[PDB]
Ligand binder design. Sequence first.
Ligand code: U1H
Length: 330
Amino acid sequence: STGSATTTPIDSLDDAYITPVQIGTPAQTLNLDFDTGSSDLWVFSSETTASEVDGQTIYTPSKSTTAKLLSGATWSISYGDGSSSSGDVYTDTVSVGGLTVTGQAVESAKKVSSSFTEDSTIDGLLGLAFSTLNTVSPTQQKTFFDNAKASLDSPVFTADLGYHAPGTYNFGFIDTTAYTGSITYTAVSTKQGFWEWTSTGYAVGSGTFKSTSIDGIADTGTTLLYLPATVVSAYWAQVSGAKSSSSVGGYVFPCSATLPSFTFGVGSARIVIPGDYIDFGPISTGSSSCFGGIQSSAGIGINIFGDVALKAAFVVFNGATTPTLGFASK
Ligand SMILES: NCc1ccc(C(F)(F)F)cc1
């Protein structure tokens, strides 16, 4: 079997991408943020604290004839940005673009942090990292992909994120019309539960390629590209007026600048991120200081190939016995 669903940026900056997901019987459609950086499928629900819901679509397990309370199960998760959520668990039928998983753990939120309440467009998250990161206690639960894997035509999912445009999440098949050239596959370490891999280096604009190993995660749930301070300083040194600002919390640059591209290595292959992808607009409404899409990973403790990098490529998350990542230009 296969699945195919369109993913759409939540706003004009591509801060995040939402993908419609059907939960329960009759179907309840919620727009979830597909996140390869986490492994919990959680949703705003009829159990979420009323003052913490502001425009989100909720899942009401009492209206689903297939919903079952997963007795005694709770979940609690904290994300890299400081956001968090927690609640109880139901099992229910969940489908993504035609692909159905019966008995999928649907973590119903009882509490959500302010960042989630403020994002009226995001009804929850659908984790796609390894199930080892799943927070359901006392019985750890599998991701949607892990549960669908055996039934898929090929044990893969692909991320084809658009730049200020819709894109596609495919499950179980590789669309050979969605990319140019060939897909370059690279090794993955699952030791930290992420799609963790090693980039072979970088270039800034038309500069010479620097061969250097950059360990990092392919994370659809992270907006920006977080790389080592050396790499990020080399990039921003090419933009007149660019600087790191502690008051803003990162590199900012004059909104009047035309940014250089950023190339990242995938084995002997190169993925070019166009300069316009690196512009995250004014730091505040009406400001002439723009926020950079390439930031330092120094405070995080891991490099993150977020949406800025992933949207420049057709990306294969190969969940075979030996998992790999494939990258192709598009
Ligand atoms: N990396 C996961 C993630 C995704 C979205 C959000 C936000 F911004 F919607 F709250 C936080 C954390």
